[PDB]
Amino acid sequence: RGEVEQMKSCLRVLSQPMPPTAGEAEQAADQQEREGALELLADLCENMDNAADFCQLSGMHLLVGRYLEAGAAGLRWRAAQLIGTCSQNVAAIQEQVLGLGALRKLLRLLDRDACDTVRVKALFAISCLVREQEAGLLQFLRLDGFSVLMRAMQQQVQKLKVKSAFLLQNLLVGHPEHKGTLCSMGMVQQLVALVRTEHSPFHEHVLGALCSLVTDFPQGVRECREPELGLEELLRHRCQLLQQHEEYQEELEFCEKLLQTCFS
Protein backbone atom coordinates (compact mmCIF):
# COMPACT_ATOMS: atom_id res chain seq x y z
CA ARG A 1 0.00 0.00 0.00
CA GLY A 2 2.37 2.71 1.33
CA GLU A 3 -0.53 4.56 3.00
CA VAL A 4 0.41 4.30 6.70
CA GLU A 5 3.83 5.78 5.86
CA GLN A 6 2.37 8.61 3.78
CA MET A 7 -0.01 9.39 6.63
CA LYS A 8 2.79 9.39 9.22
CA SER A 9 5.10 11.45 6.98
CA CYS A 10 2.35 14.02 6.42
CA LEU A 11 1.61 14.27 10.18
CA ARG A 12 5.38 14.82 10.68
CA VAL A 13 5.35 17.76 8.25
CA LEU A 14 2.25 19.24 9.92
CA SER A 15 3.60 18.64 13.44
CA GLN A 16 6.72 20.75 12.76
CA PRO A 17 6.76 24.23 14.39
CA MET A 18 6.15 27.21 12.13
CA PRO A 19 9.70 28.35 11.10
CA PRO A 20 10.94 31.05 13.55
CA THR A 21 12.86 33.81 11.79
CA ALA A 22 11.69 33.32 8.19
CA GLY A 23 11.93 35.29 4.96
CA GLU A 24 9.09 35.26 2.41
CA ALA A 25 10.47 32.45 0.25
CA GLU A 26 11.01 30.22 3.31
CA GLN A 27 7.51 31.04 4.64
CA ALA A 28 5.89 30.37 1.24
CA ALA A 29 7.74 27.05 0.74
CA ASP A 30 6.82 25.99 4.31
CA GLN A 31 3.12 26.78 3.68
CA GLN A 32 3.09 24.83 0.37
CA GLU A 33 4.61 21.77 2.09
CA ARG A 34 1.88 21.89 4.80
CA GLU A 35 -0.83 22.45 2.16
CA GLY A 36 0.51 19.42 0.25
CA ALA A 37 0.50 17.30 3.43
CA LEU A 38 -3.17 18.18 4.11
CA GLU A 39 -4.03 17.36 0.48
CA LEU A 40 -2.26 13.98 0.62
CA LEU A 41 -4.04 13.26 3.91
CA ALA A 42 -7.39 14.17 2.28
CA ASP A 43 -6.75 11.62 -0.53
CA LEU A 44 -5.98 8.95 2.10
CA CYS A 45 -8.92 9.94 4.28
CA GLU A 46 -11.64 9.39 1.63
CA ASN A 47 -11.26 5.78 2.82
CA MET A 48 -13.08 5.33 6.17
CA ASP A 49 -10.32 3.12 7.66
CA ASN A 50 -7.56 5.62 6.82
CA ALA A 51 -9.84 8.25 8.38
CA ALA A 52 -10.06 6.17 11.59
CA ASP A 53 -6.30 5.52 11.56
CA PHE A 54 -5.79 9.28 11.16
CA CYS A 55 -7.85 9.90 14.32
CA GLN A 56 -6.07 7.10 16.16
CA LEU A 57 -2.83 8.99 15.33
CA SER A 58 -4.24 12.18 16.96
CA GLY A 59 -4.52 13.97 13.61
CA MET A 60 -7.82 15.62 14.62
CA HIS A 61 -6.07 16.97 17.74
CA LEU A 62 -3.53 18.69 15.45
CA LEU A 63 -6.08 20.02 12.92
CA VAL A 64 -8.50 21.36 15.53
CA GLY A 65 -5.75 22.62 17.87
CA ARG A 66 -3.44 24.29 15.32
CA TYR A 67 -4.69 24.40 11.71
CA LEU A 68 -8.26 25.82 11.97
CA GLU A 69 -6.63 28.98 13.40
CA ALA A 70 -3.55 28.96 11.17
CA GLY A 71 -2.51 32.36 9.79
CA ALA A 72 -2.85 31.21 6.16
CA ALA A 73 -6.31 30.73 4.62
CA GLY A 74 -4.95 27.85 2.49
CA LEU A 75 -4.20 25.82 5.64
CA ARG A 76 -7.47 26.72 7.38
CA TRP A 77 -9.67 25.62 4.47
CA ARG A 78 -7.70 22.46 3.80
CA ALA A 79 -7.88 21.67 7.55
CA ALA A 80 -11.67 22.24 7.64
CA GLN A 81 -12.07 20.13 4.46
CA LEU A 82 -10.08 17.23 5.92
CA ILE A 83 -12.18 17.28 9.11
CA GLY A 84 -15.31 17.03 6.95
CA THR A 85 -13.86 14.24 4.77
CA CYS A 86 -12.93 12.11 7.77
CA SER A 87 -16.08 12.73 9.78
CA GLN A 88 -18.66 12.69 6.98
CA ASN A 89 -19.33 8.96 6.97
CA VAL A 90 -18.18 7.85 10.46
CA ALA A 91 -20.29 8.46 13.59
CA ALA A 92 -17.35 7.65 15.91
CA ILE A 93 -15.16 10.33 14.24
CA GLN A 94 -18.00 12.90 14.39
CA GLU A 95 -18.19 12.35 18.16
CA GLN A 96 -14.41 12.54 18.58
CA VAL A 97 -14.20 15.79 16.56
CA LEU A 98 -17.10 17.35 18.50
CA GLY A 99 -15.39 16.46 21.81
CA LEU A 100 -12.25 18.34 20.62
CA GLY A 101 -14.12 21.66 20.40
CA ALA A 102 -14.15 21.75 16.56
CA LEU A 103 -17.66 23.26 16.22
CA ARG A 104 -16.91 26.58 18.00
CA LYS A 105 -13.81 27.06 15.80
CA LEU A 106 -15.65 26.04 12.60
CA LEU A 107 -18.57 28.38 13.32
CA ARG A 108 -16.09 31.20 13.91
CA LEU A 109 -14.49 30.49 10.48
CA LEU A 110 -17.87 30.25 8.76
CA ASP A 111 -19.04 33.51 10.33
CA ARG A 112 -15.94 35.70 10.22
CA ASP A 113 -13.25 34.45 7.84
CA ALA A 114 -11.94 36.83 5.15
CA CYS A 115 -11.54 33.93 2.69
CA ASP A 116 -14.72 32.51 1.10
CA THR A 117 -13.18 29.02 0.50
CA VAL A 118 -12.50 28.76 4.26
CA ARG A 119 -16.14 29.62 4.95
CA VAL A 120 -17.40 27.03 2.45
CA LYS A 121 -15.16 24.24 3.81
CA ALA A 122 -16.03 25.20 7.39
CA LEU A 123 -19.69 24.87 6.43
CA PHE A 124 -18.92 21.51 4.87
CA ALA A 125 -17.17 20.38 8.07
CA ILE A 126 -20.07 21.68 10.23
CA SER A 127 -22.64 19.90 8.04
CA CYS A 128 -20.76 16.59 8.52
CA LEU A 129 -20.66 17.00 12.33
CA VAL A 130 -24.18 18.23 12.99
CA ARG A 131 -26.55 16.49 10.58
CA GLU A 132 -26.57 12.92 11.96
CA GLN A 133 -25.49 13.93 15.50
CA GLU A 134 -28.07 14.94 18.11
CA ALA A 135 -25.38 16.12 20.55
CA GLY A 136 -23.54 18.08 17.79
CA LEU A 137 -26.76 19.83 16.79
CA LEU A 138 -27.60 20.68 20.43
CA GLN A 139 -24.12 22.25 20.69
CA PHE A 140 -24.63 23.97 17.33
CA LEU A 141 -27.80 25.57 18.80
CA ARG A 142 -26.01 26.52 22.01
CA LEU A 143 -23.24 28.08 19.83
CA ASP A 144 -25.79 30.26 17.95
CA GLY A 145 -25.16 28.33 14.75
CA PHE A 146 -28.58 29.07 13.24
CA SER A 147 -27.80 32.81 13.36
CA VAL A 148 -24.43 32.06 11.70
CA LEU A 149 -26.24 30.17 8.91
CA MET A 150 -28.71 33.05 8.61
CA ARG A 151 -25.92 35.63 8.16
CA ALA A 152 -24.37 33.26 5.55
CA MET A 153 -27.70 33.30 3.66
CA GLN A 154 -27.81 37.11 4.01
CA GLN A 155 -24.33 37.84 2.55
CA GLN A 156 -23.40 38.20 -1.10
CA VAL A 157 -21.58 35.03 -2.27
CA GLN A 158 -24.16 32.75 -3.90
CA LYS A 159 -22.35 29.44 -3.33
CA LEU A 160 -22.32 29.98 0.45
CA LYS A 161 -25.94 31.22 0.55
CA VAL A 162 -27.22 28.14 -1.32
CA LYS A 163 -25.19 25.70 0.81
CA SER A 164 -26.17 27.40 4.10
CA ALA A 165 -29.87 27.46 3.10
CA PHE A 166 -29.56 23.81 2.07
CA LEU A 167 -28.13 22.94 5.49
CA LEU A 168 -30.85 24.86 7.37
CA GLN A 169 -33.55 23.07 5.34
CA ASN A 170 -31.93 19.66 6.01
CA LEU A 171 -31.64 20.27 9.80
CA LEU A 172 -35.28 21.36 10.01
CA VAL A 173 -36.45 18.20 8.18
CA GLY A 174 -34.14 15.93 10.24
CA HIS A 175 -34.78 17.62 13.61
CA PRO A 176 -38.33 19.07 13.98
CA GLU A 177 -38.06 19.28 17.79
CA HIS A 178 -36.30 22.64 17.23
CA LYS A 179 -39.09 24.50 15.37
CA GLY A 180 -40.17 26.29 18.58
CA THR A 181 -36.71 27.69 19.32
CA LEU A 182 -36.23 28.75 15.71
CA CYS A 183 -39.64 30.45 15.55
CA SER A 184 -38.99 32.20 18.89
CA MET A 185 -35.67 33.41 17.46
CA GLY A 186 -37.62 35.20 14.70
CA MET A 187 -36.51 32.87 11.89
CA VAL A 188 -39.88 33.08 10.10
CA GLN A 189 -39.28 36.84 9.69
CA GLN A 190 -35.62 36.44 8.68
CA LEU A 191 -36.41 33.70 6.15
CA VAL A 192 -39.33 35.66 4.67
CA ALA A 193 -36.96 38.61 4.20
CA LEU A 194 -34.78 36.32 2.05
CA VAL A 195 -37.86 35.42 0.00
CA ARG A 196 -38.27 39.16 -0.75
CA THR A 197 -34.87 39.28 -2.49
CA GLU A 198 -34.32 38.69 -6.21
CA HIS A 199 -35.45 35.19 -7.15
CA SER A 200 -32.52 32.76 -7.32
CA PRO A 201 -31.74 29.07 -6.53
CA PHE A 202 -31.33 29.46 -2.74
CA HIS A 203 -35.03 30.53 -2.52
CA GLU A 204 -36.09 26.88 -2.89
CA HIS A 205 -34.31 25.92 0.32
CA VAL A 206 -35.48 29.04 2.18
CA LEU A 207 -39.12 28.21 1.36
CA GLY A 208 -38.52 24.53 2.13
CA ALA A 209 -37.33 25.61 5.60
CA LEU A 210 -40.41 27.80 6.10
CA CYS A 211 -42.52 24.80 5.13
CA SER A 212 -40.92 22.75 7.90
CA LEU A 213 -41.66 25.52 10.43
CA VAL A 214 -45.42 25.66 9.72
CA THR A 215 -45.98 21.94 9.25
CA ASP A 216 -48.12 20.79 12.23
CA PHE A 217 -46.75 23.75 14.16
CA PRO A 218 -49.26 26.44 15.26
CA GLN A 219 -46.53 28.93 16.29
CA GLY A 220 -45.04 28.83 12.79
CA VAL A 221 -48.47 29.38 11.22
CA ARG A 222 -49.12 32.31 13.61
CA GLU A 223 -45.80 33.98 12.70
CA CYS A 224 -46.42 33.44 8.96
CA ARG A 225 -49.87 35.10 9.34
CA GLU A 226 -48.51 38.23 11.10
CA PRO A 227 -50.02 41.24 9.19
CA GLU A 228 -46.74 43.18 8.94
CA LEU A 229 -44.86 40.25 7.39
CA GLY A 230 -46.88 40.45 4.15
CA LEU A 231 -46.17 36.79 3.37
CA GLU A 232 -49.42 35.92 1.52
CA GLU A 233 -48.73 38.59 -1.14
CA LEU A 234 -45.17 37.25 -1.53
CA LEU A 235 -46.24 33.60 -1.92
CA ARG A 236 -48.96 34.40 -4.48
CA HIS A 237 -46.62 36.46 -6.66
CA ARG A 238 -44.02 33.66 -6.41
CA CYS A 239 -46.61 31.01 -7.40
CA GLN A 240 -47.57 32.95 -10.53
CA LEU A 241 -43.85 33.46 -11.39
CA LEU A 242 -43.01 29.73 -11.10
CA GLN A 243 -46.16 27.89 -12.12
CA GLN A 244 -45.49 27.23 -15.84
CA HIS A 245 -41.83 26.20 -15.27
CA GLU A 246 -41.04 22.56 -14.61
CA GLU A 247 -37.60 23.33 -13.02
CA TYR A 248 -39.06 25.34 -10.10
CA GLN A 249 -41.74 22.74 -9.34
CA GLU A 250 -40.26 22.04 -5.87
CA GLU A 251 -40.09 25.69 -4.75
CA LEU A 252 -43.60 26.10 -6.21
CA GLU A 253 -44.81 23.11 -4.14
CA PHE A 254 -43.35 24.78 -0.99
CA CYS A 255 -45.18 28.06 -1.79
CA GLU A 256 -48.44 26.21 -2.41
CA LYS A 257 -48.06 24.22 0.81
CA LEU A 258 -47.46 27.46 2.73
CA LEU A 259 -50.52 29.06 1.15
CA GLN A 260 -52.64 25.98 1.93
CA THR A 261 -51.31 25.65 5.49
CA CYS A 262 -51.37 29.36 6.39
CA PHE A 263 -53.81 31.25 4.12
CA SER A 264 -56.88 28.98 3.65
From Swiss-Prot:
GO CC annotation, single: extracellular space
Superkingdom assignment: Eukaryota
Keywords, ordered alphabetically: Phosphoprotein, Repeat
Record function comment: Inhibits HSPA1A chaperone activity by changing the conformation of the ATP-binding domain of HSPA1A and interfering with ATP binding. Interferes with ubiquitination mediated by STUB1 and inhibits chaperone-assisted degradation of immature CFTR.
A GO MF label: ubiquitin protein ligase binding
Tissues showing expression: Ubiquitous.
GO biological process, one term: protein folding
Protein name: Hsp70-binding protein 1
ARM repeat ranges per the UniProt record: 46-88, 91-131, 134-173, 176-215
UniProt entry tagged with the keyword NADP: no
Residues of the whole record sequence present: 87 to 350 of 359
Subunit structure: Interacts with the ATP-binding domain of HSPA1A. Detected in a ternary complex containing STUB1, HSPA1A and HSPBP1. Interacts with PGLYRP1; this interaction blocks the cytotoxic activity of the PGLYRP1-HSPA1A complex.
